Write a protein that binds this ligand. Structure first.
Ligand SMILES: *[C@@H]1O[C@H](CO)[C@@H](O)[C@H](O)[C@H]1NC(C)=O
Ligand SMILES: *[C@@H]1O[C@H](CO)[C@@H](O)[C@H](O)[C@H]1NC(C)=O
Ligand SMILES: [Zn+2]
Length: 203
């Protein structure tokens, strides 16, 4: 929750609407659909890039800790999972002597990694929610929650809650749902999704 709340503010502030309203961006600057596509793809290379990697890493760690993977089949299973979840193949073969996942900082320093997954969703579930109280009409990526007191009050109703109540109840106070949902992310990236589908006709 902490990082999602921190991140939605930056997501809204980076919009060209707030930039042209703050004076940094000249008012005589109309955003072309090409620039919107470029910005969406730059965002996706981070947001949608990290999701399969995070999910695969956490699944491998859970399967190791649960004993489903034998100690002599770790790297085999790891590079098997990476070839069908992340879609990434190792350039050179690795035996059980390697510990490639341990080369990551969060693995060798004993940090839970699933946090970076849910945080990627929650923010969008927040953002898509906060644009409803802000009465946004256009695409989600152009939404700005500024100047709208209703969205701020809806957010604060959960912010003041803290840990006193279950996180599901906190979600229902903003997104109106008890379980995490991925539909806001797809709604956010739909303009990029259509363009990507159109660009891959022959590939
Ligand atoms: C919010 O209100 C201020 C005050 O009039 C205005 O300057 C600004 O353009 C409005 N919109 C945004 C996105 O800041
Ligand atoms: C932007 O819209 C124009 C008008 O339909 C179109 O010709 C152009 O291909 C579009 N570009 C992108 C990146 O969507
Ligand atoms: Zn932070």
């Amino acid at each position: 929750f902490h990082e999602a709340v921190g991140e939605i503010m930056s997501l809204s502030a980076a919009t060209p609407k707030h930039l042209k309203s703050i004076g940094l961006l000249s008012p005589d600057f109309q955003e072309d659909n090409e620039t919107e596509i470029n910005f969406l793809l730059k965002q996706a290379l981070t947001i949608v890039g990290t999701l399969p990697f995070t999910y695969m890493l956490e699944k491998w760690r859970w399967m190791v800790f649960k004993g489903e993977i034998p100690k002599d089949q770790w790297m085999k299973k790891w590079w098997e999972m990476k070839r069908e979840i992340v879609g990434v193949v190792e350039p050179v073969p690795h035996d059980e002597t390697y510990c490639d996942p341990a080369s990551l900082f969060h693995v060798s320093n004993d940090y839970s990694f699933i946090r970076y997954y849910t945080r990627t969703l929650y923010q969008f579930q927040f953002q898509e929610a906060l644009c409803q109280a802000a009465k946004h009409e256009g695409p989600l990526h152009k939404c700005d929650i500024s100047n709208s007191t209703e969205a701020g009050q809806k957010l604060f109703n959960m912010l003041r809650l803290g840990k006193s109540e279950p996180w599901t109840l906190a979600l229902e106070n903003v997104v109106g749902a008890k379980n995490m949902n991925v539909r806001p992310l797809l709604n956010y990236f739909e303009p990029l999704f259509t363009w990507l589908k159109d660009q891959n006709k022959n590939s």
